[PDB]
Design a protein around this ligand. Structure first.
Ligand code: NAP
Ligand code: NAP
Ligand code: NAP
Ligand code: NAP
Ligand code: NA
Ligand code: NA
Ligand code: NA
Ligand code: NA
Ligand code: NA
Ligand code: NA
Ligand code: NA
Ligand code: NA
Lengths: 330, 330, 330, 330
């Protein structure tokens, strides 16, 4: 296969993580980006990163192109999909990382201008088909617009895949302890709701997520069986899924941990891993696994009532899945 | 009743919170403290607090006495209970806030020197009787040495009391998102185990707690039915209990929230309250309630599988219970 | 005097601090506010504050009015000064706390609609007269539009007043270690320049300030003699001025500290104080002094080369000066 | 030259940074360490680092040896220099990183047991000769016990070298904005003085440093001409020197920046660099330069009164100098 050619719409945390990941691999090539910023600021943000460290390599411009380690990348700056002829620079797949385009209606214009496939970097706001690697990726039907779901779906999903396949999930509730993100306020200031208005680096902030209820999209046998919620805490990156569930049969802790290690070695290779070293959140910064189960934190009480704790780099793991998904569907 | 006279052994976060709470009430009087610090540093730490703000009032010394708003308080500085004649300064109850004395054997010397009652500010390391206000305080038998359990027991306990009395708990697992505390490291440095060695203000740190399994001490019907664990996050104070449980019957969200509001108004007055305002952690700094249930975060799936989220000021709520317990047993 | 009636345009950190300060005093009355938020969010942000704690008292609405402890306050929600008939609700002075209106041209519409006086909550972007209490407030000429300068001017200004009056300033450079503020990013994301794009709670961020060069506006004898700069650090509130200067004559540390204590007791009463207790930043949260000189940090080398360190609550001290200035010019 | 063989006494932040730096170079070899920890915790802390990331490579034990990428390193665990036969494992130089041994008297026992040279990882508490690379390293006389001074000396020193050589320093005062370190408290708790007792991740904390006054040890022409102080802020690593000085003649900003760039390219190659990219603190995590002058922050007022801002990774820059110094004196 020729390396699939892709464009990135939206050069934020996910956009720039995706770009770095594409530049480390030989089976995918970045030809264009779009962000509503001047080129001096694009270069600076790409080169220097508080979380993932300095990009090793030259980051130059000339004058509508990023030049990264000598390779030219076209840079657009328009809010309007009309002005983004990504296909004209060779793009086969657009990675949609703006947060602005989460319906087929708003992504169809890319296809109409000659892009073959669009992948949303977030849950769809309509009935756009949703795919998650290792969970329902085997069912892909060649659709030209898909959702890759959320960072949380790409941790919780693989965990559920293993539990459902080995044991059976009767019901479950999930909390995520989640790193703060953009569109949380630095100081108490107006936002879309009360709790999101409060200072993110000095509070525990309850925040809603549809990630659990929406598992029906990628595992329909879990329709009506899972819900959950989030607690935003003062870390800049890395999060955990805390899944509490009732399984269809009696299990032990060891049996659960062994099922995860067996998937880590086979069907979820590269996607789920198991931590036997007692790491903390910062150890998973720039980790490409979507789920890291902390084996020592696995609990079972009264035969069938379990807790599983899985880390995810909400930036780097999800970005790693977006890039895997572009390579998979090409 | 004459105001019960008490001494505080250990003038740390709990010791100093307890002292401030005693100085705001007329039914308890502080006569002595002990801490292995010089008197200049005792005054400074008591007067200024990063979390709970400046003490309003005069904080002076003369020269073995704190003088707080004109009232003289004896200050000892010895690690050894032998040198602490608290009873000689009128103390009826010792609040044991050192972390050093969590067995009847190590507290008996206080009784032997004329103290009437000792209350441990932590779970006992032996079979010392444990009491929690609103949970099993009605069963107190006049024992002269007791444990008031942990900050977590004084949030989770009252929550369980309500769930058990209205609905029946079949089984449950708990996560606490907990503020960092003393004897967590500022930077990666050796501690009693791996995870406790890691920088507390820049990581999510899984940490063990016996608080759930130990609920059998205060609610024996929950023997073998609860376990749980902790995630230390970068907040200086205030924590949450996240309880996931299977109840003995079908319930709704509204029914659970109404049971909490009914206890808040009756048997758990002053102990449990319900938040209907969508507060965040910093809103509960210096809150005297041991449990604040966030009503909007209450979840039920598949009839009987529930999640309840309750805040607690791990410093001020527990300290408020220690002071209530001293007044109650006097 | 009747209590001067004021309106607040812009209900952010400064707007809400100003409002709380007005509600604690009997010589000024708040009749109206404006902020582009729904009334539910206005109430929540006013009631709960991560930094300054819960407002003690009832915060209700009915339905275009905040009702605070029973007193009705009109709430507008328009970006356009055209729609803000503050004078119709009795306002004599508008406190301009939006950041949007820092020229006489943009504030004249308030006067044209019957407001007597406007005070900008920031340095003017034109030649609008600037006044700072204790510095050049004695020179006020009855102007109907003024600037109260910046939080930094209201710390550095009073410090310079004392140094200039006792000793003579030949030249000086200033660094401020400054709390993060709104319009700093939570995560690395595009902003008006490179450094402002970087995560505020995980970096030391050099940031420009005109506060030193602009001292000529309030002390013309310092024209061309001072410049300085800022380092934003991860604290939510409270900052320091670090002034390094060459004085016109030889001085000692004691002589400098005594000059500050003498101004604290006389001409800068309520404005500058001296800390002899070795406090840290969080001790000055909700402090109404514009400058708190840390006496133990005062340095002199080689006769005439000095350093002075002064704290300021960048929110509460400046807000306290805005309210003092409204009362002073009424 | 054979690669000089060294041992590390004290495996904390400096000890472990030094070890990682030694394992990346071919001109120095690590044969032994000492730390009062069990071997499981030594491995974990070496392998995982909140600040500098995961060690790339195998970290094993057998059973009194770290095995790092296949190479055996002896591990002692004794507080007493008596039990540390580093020379028996081939060590020529001991890097003294405990903080416990800062006099010739306390380091002489190493020489007496066959070590050729000891380097203190901190300023000496006696008249032990002090050397700093690029500053007075050319004057080394073969002394077998030296101090490498402090992290701050290894930033401020090189900056002064350039200013003194090009312009002449008449006098100067310095502030450092410094990352928190071990032996600062996580929560308000007793420490050696008042300010060090206060919570390090939620305050700006004034802290004393002898680094400026002590410049006379490495540049005697600066005897009595410099003093300074520190402000600890909530960052886990990386600090800045803010030097304010009066030079012997008139200079411009450009002239100062050009003098630094010229030293960066010649006599201070590898030691001082100049930032022309507007980086923030986290960009210098794991930076080996002892001084990074931020060229855009250089200020001059009234001919001869200057400010210079220089970053340093207080861990990695100093550690890089310790390793350079061991190679230089071998
Ligand atoms: N943990 C995570 O961060 C994470 C993980 C997985 C999924 N996601 C999802 O990924 C998406 C991006 O999140 P993020 O964290 O990368 O946010 P971000 O850092 O704010 O990135 C979004 C970027 O898109 C730009 N943008 C917005 N609308 C645009 C438009 N119409 N045309 C062009 N550029 C536009 C933004 O500029 P402006 O700021 O000026 O609007 C910004 O640079 C969202 O859908 C988010 O939910 C986030
Ligand atoms: N969230 C909370 O903080 C919280 C809540 C509920 C329960 N607790 C429990 O309350 C107790 C105290 O916790 P804390 O957070 O207040 O800790 P802390 O701030 O470290 O306070 C403990 C204090 O006791 C002193 N001390 C220790 N051993 C002593 C002895 N033998 N004699 C005299 N003084 C002694 C310590 O001095 P040294 O530092 O020199 O040893 C320190 O000042 C522990 O049992 C803890 O588990 C904590
Ligand atoms: N340390 C400090 O915070 C400090 C100290 C002294 C001086 N100041 C100055 O005080 C002013 C406010 O600062 P702040 O920290 O309070 O910022 P803030 O919290 O962002 O407050 C500004 C508020 O004004 C609103 N607003 C903006 N433009 C408006 C308009 N045209 N009409 C109505 N409302 C409008 C904003 O809504 P939107 O967010 O939607 O625009 C926001 O609620 C600035 O001039 C600032 O430089 C700040
Ligand atoms: N920014 C920086 O961190 C920095 C920069 C330059 C210079 N330094 C200097 O470098 C030295 C170490 O600082 P650090 O930050 O690495 O501190 P650290 O992380 O606390 O490391 C010190 C280590 O030495 C151990 N230790 C102490 N006394 C010992 C003894 N007698 N024998 C054996 N091991 C002993 C400690 O164990 P215990 O904790 O049990 O005592 C700890 O592991 C100090 O002199 C410091 O001032 C620090
Ligand atoms: Na590539
Ligand atoms: Na927020
Ligand atoms: Na009392
Ligand atoms: Na820790
Ligand atoms: Na009033
Ligand atoms: Na910023
Ligand atoms: Na080596
Ligand atoms: Na400290």
């Amino acid at each position: 296969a020729m390396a699939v050619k892709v464009a990135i719409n939206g050069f934020g945390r996910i956009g720039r993580c995706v770009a770095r990941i594409i530049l480390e691999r030989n089976d995918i090539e970045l030809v264009a980006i779009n962000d509503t910023t001047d080129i001096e600021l694009t270069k600076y943000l790409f080169k220097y990163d508080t979380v993932h460290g300095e990009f090793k390599g030259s980051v130059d411009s000339e004058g509508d192109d990023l030049v990264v380690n000598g390779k030219k990348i076209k840079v657009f700056k328009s809010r309007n999909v009309k002005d983004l002829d990504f296909a004209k620079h060779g793009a086969q797949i657009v990675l949609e990382c703006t947060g602005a385009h989460l319906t087929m209606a708003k992504c169809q214009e890319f296809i109409d201008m000659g892009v073959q496939k669009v992948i949303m970097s977030a849950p769809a706001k309509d009935d756009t088909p949703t795919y998650v690697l290792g969970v329902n990726s085997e069912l892909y039907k060649g659709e030209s617009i898909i959702s890759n779901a959320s960072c949380t779906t790409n941790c919780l999903g693989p965990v559920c895949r293993v539990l459902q396949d080995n044991f059976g999930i009767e019901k479950g509730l999930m909390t995520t302890i989640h790193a703060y993100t953009n569109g949380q306020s630095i100081i108490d200031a107006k936002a879309k709701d009360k709790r999101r208005s409060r200072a993110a680096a000095q509070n525990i902030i309850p925040t809603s997520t549809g990630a659990a209820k929406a598992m029906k999209l990628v595992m329909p046998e879990l329709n009506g069986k899972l819900h959950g919620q989030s607690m935003r805490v003062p870390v800049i990156d890395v999060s955990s899924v805390d899944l509490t569930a009732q399984l269809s049969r009696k299990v032990s802790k060891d049996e659960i941990n062994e099922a995860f290690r067996k998937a880590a070695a086979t069907n979820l290779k590269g996607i789920l891993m198991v931590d036997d070293d007692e790491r903390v959140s910062s150890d998973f910064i720039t980790c490409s696994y979507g789920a890291i189960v902390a084996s020592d934190l696995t609990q079972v009480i009264a035969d069938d009532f379990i807790k599983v704790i899985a880390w995810y780099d909400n930036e780097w793991g999800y970005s790693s899945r977006l890039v895997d998904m572009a390579v998979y569907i090409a």
